[PDB]
């Protein structure tokens, strides 16, 4: 137990359709060659992801179309594909902790 929470804790950014879908993205320079969907959830699991995001202070961005499209196309453990490269970059840019 705890893999979900540990995944959310290390996440880069979460994109959500409020109360419905949460997509947890992870990108680490030199580890992941592309942004990775490390966790997803619909309905009850989406709400839990969102509570965990709040607990761990993970940036959460509301974007209903993008969250729905990611949910459909990019499964847990899969890297994002070409259509998502730039939309996801924009999430990452707004979410990165500069650490100062």
Short mmCIF file of N, CA and C in Angstrom, two decimals:
data_model
loop_
_atom_site.label_atom_id
_atom_site.label_comp_id
_atom_site.label_asym_id
_atom_site.label_seq_id
_atom_site.Cartn_x
_atom_site.Cartn_y
_atom_site.Cartn_z
N UNK A 1 0.86 -1.22 0.00
CA UNK A 1 0.00 0.00 0.00
C UNK A 1 0.88 1.25 0.00
N UNK A 2 0.36 2.33 -0.55
CA UNK A 2 1.05 3.63 -0.55
C UNK A 2 1.64 4.09 -1.87
N UNK A 3 1.60 3.23 -2.86
CA UNK A 3 2.15 3.53 -4.16
C UNK A 3 1.44 4.74 -4.76
N UNK A 4 0.12 4.87 -4.57
CA UNK A 4 -0.62 6.01 -5.14
C UNK A 4 -0.10 7.27 -4.51
N UNK A 5 -0.06 7.30 -3.18
CA UNK A 5 0.41 8.50 -2.49
C UNK A 5 1.86 8.85 -2.87
N UNK A 6 2.73 7.84 -2.95
CA UNK A 6 4.12 8.13 -3.32
C UNK A 6 4.21 8.67 -4.76
N UNK A 7 3.38 8.13 -5.64
CA UNK A 7 3.32 8.64 -7.01
C UNK A 7 2.87 10.09 -7.02
N UNK A 8 1.82 10.42 -6.30
CA UNK A 8 1.35 11.82 -6.28
C UNK A 8 2.43 12.72 -5.66
N UNK A 9 3.07 12.27 -4.58
CA UNK A 9 4.08 13.10 -3.91
C UNK A 9 5.23 13.53 -4.82
N UNK A 10 5.64 12.64 -5.71
CA UNK A 10 6.75 12.96 -6.59
C UNK A 10 6.33 13.59 -7.91
N UNK A 11 5.01 13.67 -8.15
CA UNK A 11 4.41 14.20 -9.40
C UNK A 11 4.91 15.63 -9.68
N UNK A 12 4.84 16.02 -10.95
CA UNK A 12 5.20 17.35 -11.38
C UNK A 12 3.98 18.25 -11.42
N UNK A 13 2.90 17.76 -12.03
CA UNK A 13 1.70 18.55 -12.18
C UNK A 13 0.52 17.62 -12.38
N UNK A 14 -0.64 18.06 -11.91
CA UNK A 14 -1.88 17.32 -12.11
C UNK A 14 -2.79 18.20 -12.95
N UNK A 15 -3.38 17.60 -13.98
CA UNK A 15 -4.40 18.29 -14.76
C UNK A 15 -5.73 17.58 -14.54
N UNK A 16 -6.77 18.39 -14.30
CA UNK A 16 -8.03 17.84 -13.87
C UNK A 16 -9.23 18.42 -14.63
N UNK A 17 -10.24 17.58 -14.71
CA UNK A 17 -11.60 18.00 -15.03
C UNK A 17 -12.29 17.92 -13.66
N UNK A 18 -12.68 19.07 -13.08
CA UNK A 18 -13.15 19.09 -11.69
C UNK A 18 -14.15 18.00 -11.38
N UNK A 19 -13.88 17.30 -10.27
CA UNK A 19 -14.70 16.23 -9.71
C UNK A 19 -14.79 14.94 -10.55
N UNK A 20 -14.04 14.85 -11.66
CA UNK A 20 -14.28 13.81 -12.66
C UNK A 20 -13.03 13.05 -13.15
N UNK A 21 -11.98 13.78 -13.48
CA UNK A 21 -10.76 13.18 -14.03
C UNK A 21 -9.56 13.89 -13.44
N UNK A 22 -8.55 13.10 -13.07
CA UNK A 22 -7.26 13.65 -12.66
C UNK A 22 -6.16 12.85 -13.34
N UNK A 23 -5.25 13.58 -13.99
CA UNK A 23 -4.10 13.00 -14.66
C UNK A 23 -2.87 13.52 -13.98
N UNK A 24 -2.04 12.58 -13.51
CA UNK A 24 -0.84 12.93 -12.78
C UNK A 24 0.38 12.78 -13.71
N UNK A 25 1.06 13.91 -14.00
CA UNK A 25 2.19 13.91 -14.90
C UNK A 25 3.48 14.01 -14.14
N UNK A 26 4.50 13.28 -14.61
CA UNK A 26 5.82 13.27 -14.00
C UNK A 26 6.88 13.49 -15.08
N UNK A 27 7.73 14.48 -14.85
CA UNK A 27 8.83 14.73 -15.76
C UNK A 27 10.06 15.07 -14.94
N UNK A 28 11.13 14.31 -15.17
CA UNK A 28 12.40 14.60 -14.51
C UNK A 28 13.49 14.52 -15.56
N UNK A 29 14.11 15.67 -15.82
CA UNK A 29 15.26 15.76 -16.72
C UNK A 29 16.27 14.66 -16.46
N UNK A 30 16.64 13.95 -17.53
CA UNK A 30 17.64 12.91 -17.44
C UNK A 30 17.13 11.56 -16.95
N UNK A 31 15.86 11.49 -16.54
CA UNK A 31 15.26 10.22 -16.12
C UNK A 31 14.19 9.85 -17.14
N UNK A 32 13.12 10.63 -17.18
CA UNK A 32 12.03 10.40 -18.14
C UNK A 32 12.37 11.10 -19.45
N UNK A 33 12.41 10.35 -20.57
CA UNK A 33 12.71 11.01 -21.85
C UNK A 33 11.59 11.95 -22.35
N UNK A 34 10.38 11.70 -21.87
CA UNK A 34 9.19 12.53 -22.13
C UNK A 34 8.38 12.57 -20.84
N UNK A 35 7.47 13.54 -20.74
CA UNK A 35 6.51 13.48 -19.62
C UNK A 35 5.73 12.18 -19.57
N UNK A 36 5.57 11.65 -18.38
CA UNK A 36 4.97 10.36 -18.13
C UNK A 36 3.67 10.54 -17.37
N UNK A 37 2.63 9.81 -17.77
CA UNK A 37 1.41 9.73 -16.94
C UNK A 37 1.66 8.62 -15.91
N UNK A 38 1.87 9.03 -14.67
CA UNK A 38 2.22 8.07 -13.63
C UNK A 38 1.01 7.57 -12.87
N UNK A 39 -0.05 8.38 -12.83
CA UNK A 39 -1.31 7.98 -12.22
C UNK A 39 -2.45 8.67 -12.91
N UNK A 40 -3.58 7.96 -12.99
CA UNK A 40 -4.84 8.56 -13.40
C UNK A 40 -5.96 8.19 -12.47
N UNK A 41 -7.07 8.88 -12.67
CA UNK A 41 -8.27 8.51 -11.95
C UNK A 41 -9.48 9.18 -12.50
N UNK A 42 -10.59 8.45 -12.38
CA UNK A 42 -11.91 8.97 -12.69
C UNK A 42 -12.75 8.92 -11.41
N UNK A 43 -13.65 9.89 -11.27
CA UNK A 43 -14.67 9.85 -10.21
C UNK A 43 -14.02 9.70 -8.82
N UNK A 44 -14.39 8.69 -8.02
CA UNK A 44 -13.86 8.59 -6.67
C UNK A 44 -12.32 8.67 -6.62
N UNK A 45 -11.66 7.98 -7.55
CA UNK A 45 -10.19 7.99 -7.55
C UNK A 45 -9.66 9.35 -7.95
N UNK A 46 -10.36 10.06 -8.83
CA UNK A 46 -9.93 11.41 -9.15
C UNK A 46 -9.97 12.29 -7.91
N UNK A 47 -11.02 12.15 -7.09
CA UNK A 47 -11.15 12.99 -5.89
C UNK A 47 -10.00 12.67 -4.93
N UNK A 48 -9.65 11.40 -4.82
CA UNK A 48 -8.56 11.00 -3.93
C UNK A 48 -7.23 11.56 -4.40
N UNK A 49 -6.97 11.46 -5.70
CA UNK A 49 -5.76 12.09 -6.28
C UNK A 49 -5.69 13.58 -5.95
N UNK A 50 -6.82 14.26 -6.14
CA UNK A 50 -6.87 15.68 -5.85
C UNK A 50 -6.61 15.97 -4.37
N UNK A 51 -7.13 15.14 -3.45
CA UNK A 51 -6.86 15.35 -2.00
C UNK A 51 -5.38 15.16 -1.70
N UNK A 52 -4.81 14.13 -2.30
CA UNK A 52 -3.38 13.90 -2.15
C UNK A 52 -2.54 15.01 -2.74
N UNK A 53 -2.95 15.53 -3.90
CA UNK A 53 -2.26 16.67 -4.50
C UNK A 53 -2.23 17.86 -3.54
N UNK A 54 -3.36 18.11 -2.88
CA UNK A 54 -3.41 19.19 -1.89
C UNK A 54 -2.47 18.94 -0.71
N UNK A 55 -2.46 17.70 -0.22
CA UNK A 55 -1.60 17.30 0.88
C UNK A 55 -0.12 17.52 0.57
N UNK A 56 0.28 17.21 -0.66
CA UNK A 56 1.68 17.28 -1.04
C UNK A 56 2.05 18.55 -1.80
N UNK A 57 1.09 19.46 -1.91
CA UNK A 57 1.29 20.75 -2.57
C UNK A 57 1.74 20.59 -4.02
N UNK A 58 1.14 19.64 -4.73
CA UNK A 58 1.39 19.44 -6.14
C UNK A 58 0.52 20.40 -6.92
N UNK A 59 1.11 21.17 -7.84
CA UNK A 59 0.26 22.01 -8.64
C UNK A 59 -0.84 21.29 -9.40
N UNK A 60 -2.04 21.84 -9.32
CA UNK A 60 -3.17 21.28 -10.01
C UNK A 60 -3.72 22.36 -10.92
N UNK A 61 -3.87 22.01 -12.18
CA UNK A 61 -4.37 22.91 -13.23
C UNK A 61 -5.68 22.34 -13.75
N UNK A 62 -6.73 23.19 -13.79
CA UNK A 62 -7.99 22.79 -14.37
C UNK A 62 -7.95 23.01 -15.89
N UNK A 63 -8.20 21.96 -16.65
CA UNK A 63 -8.25 22.06 -18.11
C UNK A 63 -9.06 20.86 -18.56
N UNK A 64 -10.38 21.07 -18.73
CA UNK A 64 -11.25 19.92 -18.95
C UNK A 64 -10.93 19.18 -20.26
N UNK A 65 -10.80 19.90 -21.40
CA UNK A 65 -10.50 19.18 -22.63
C UNK A 65 -9.19 18.41 -22.60
N UNK A 66 -8.16 19.02 -22.04
CA UNK A 66 -6.85 18.38 -22.00
C UNK A 66 -6.89 17.16 -21.05
N UNK A 67 -7.53 17.29 -19.90
CA UNK A 67 -7.62 16.15 -18.97
C UNK A 67 -8.39 14.99 -19.61
N UNK A 68 -9.52 15.29 -20.26
CA UNK A 68 -10.27 14.23 -20.93
C UNK A 68 -9.49 13.53 -22.05
N UNK A 69 -8.77 14.31 -22.85
CA UNK A 69 -8.00 13.72 -23.94
C UNK A 69 -6.84 12.89 -23.43
N UNK A 70 -6.11 13.41 -22.45
CA UNK A 70 -5.07 12.59 -21.84
C UNK A 70 -5.66 11.29 -21.28
N UNK A 71 -6.79 11.40 -20.57
CA UNK A 71 -7.37 10.20 -19.95
C UNK A 71 -7.67 9.11 -20.99
N UNK A 72 -8.19 9.53 -22.12
CA UNK A 72 -8.54 8.60 -23.17
C UNK A 72 -7.33 7.96 -23.87
N UNK A 73 -6.28 8.75 -24.06
CA UNK A 73 -5.22 8.38 -24.96
C UNK A 73 -3.94 7.88 -24.30
N UNK A 74 -3.65 8.36 -23.09
CA UNK A 74 -2.36 8.08 -22.43
C UNK A 74 -2.62 7.36 -21.12
N UNK A 75 -2.30 6.07 -21.10
CA UNK A 75 -2.63 5.22 -19.95
C UNK A 75 -1.57 5.32 -18.87
N UNK A 76 -1.92 4.89 -17.66
CA UNK A 76 -0.95 4.85 -16.58
C UNK A 76 0.33 4.12 -17.02
N UNK A 77 1.47 4.76 -16.78
CA UNK A 77 2.77 4.23 -17.14
C UNK A 77 3.23 4.52 -18.56
N UNK A 78 2.44 5.28 -19.33
CA UNK A 78 2.78 5.63 -20.71
C UNK A 78 3.29 7.06 -20.81
N UNK A 79 4.23 7.26 -21.71
CA UNK A 79 4.69 8.60 -22.05
C UNK A 79 3.66 9.30 -22.90
N UNK A 80 3.61 10.60 -22.80
CA UNK A 80 2.72 11.37 -23.68
C UNK A 80 3.17 11.22 -25.13
N UNK A 81 2.19 11.40 -26.03
CA UNK A 81 2.42 11.33 -27.47
C UNK A 81 2.39 12.74 -28.08
N UNK A 82 2.75 12.83 -29.35
CA UNK A 82 3.07 14.09 -30.04
C UNK A 82 2.03 15.18 -29.93
N UNK A 83 0.75 14.83 -29.98
CA UNK A 83 -0.28 15.87 -29.90
C UNK A 83 -0.26 16.63 -28.59
N UNK A 84 0.25 16.00 -27.54
CA UNK A 84 0.28 16.56 -26.19
C UNK A 84 1.57 17.26 -25.81
N UNK A 85 2.61 17.17 -26.65
CA UNK A 85 3.91 17.67 -26.24
C UNK A 85 3.87 19.12 -25.76
N UNK A 86 3.28 19.98 -26.56
CA UNK A 86 3.30 21.39 -26.20
C UNK A 86 2.29 21.75 -25.12
N UNK A 87 1.04 21.26 -25.21
CA UNK A 87 0.15 21.52 -24.06
C UNK A 87 0.71 21.08 -22.69
N UNK A 88 1.32 19.91 -22.63
CA UNK A 88 1.92 19.44 -21.41
C UNK A 88 3.15 20.26 -21.02
N UNK A 89 3.96 20.69 -22.00
CA UNK A 89 5.09 21.58 -21.68
C UNK A 89 4.60 22.84 -20.95
N UNK A 90 3.50 23.39 -21.42
CA UNK A 90 2.96 24.60 -20.80
C UNK A 90 2.56 24.32 -19.36
N UNK A 91 2.01 23.14 -19.06
CA UNK A 91 1.68 22.77 -17.66
C UNK A 91 2.94 22.65 -16.85
N UNK A 92 3.94 21.98 -17.40
CA UNK A 92 5.18 21.79 -16.70
C UNK A 92 5.81 23.13 -16.39
N UNK A 93 5.82 24.04 -17.36
CA UNK A 93 6.46 25.36 -17.13
C UNK A 93 5.81 26.11 -16.00
N UNK A 94 4.48 26.06 -15.92
CA UNK A 94 3.79 26.77 -14.87
C UNK A 94 3.95 26.06 -13.50
N UNK A 95 4.16 24.74 -13.52
CA UNK A 95 4.27 23.93 -12.30
C UNK A 95 5.65 23.77 -11.71
N UNK A 96 6.71 23.91 -12.51
CA UNK A 96 8.06 23.64 -11.98
C UNK A 96 8.38 24.49 -10.75
N UNK A 97 8.95 23.83 -9.75
CA UNK A 97 9.45 24.53 -8.58
C UNK A 97 10.87 24.91 -8.89
N UNK A 98 11.15 26.21 -8.87
CA UNK A 98 12.49 26.72 -9.15
C UNK A 98 13.43 26.55 -7.96
N UNK A 99 12.87 26.20 -6.80
CA UNK A 99 13.66 25.87 -5.60
C UNK A 99 14.45 27.04 -5.01
N UNK A 100 13.94 28.26 -5.15
CA UNK A 100 14.48 29.39 -4.42
C UNK A 100 13.42 30.31 -3.90
#
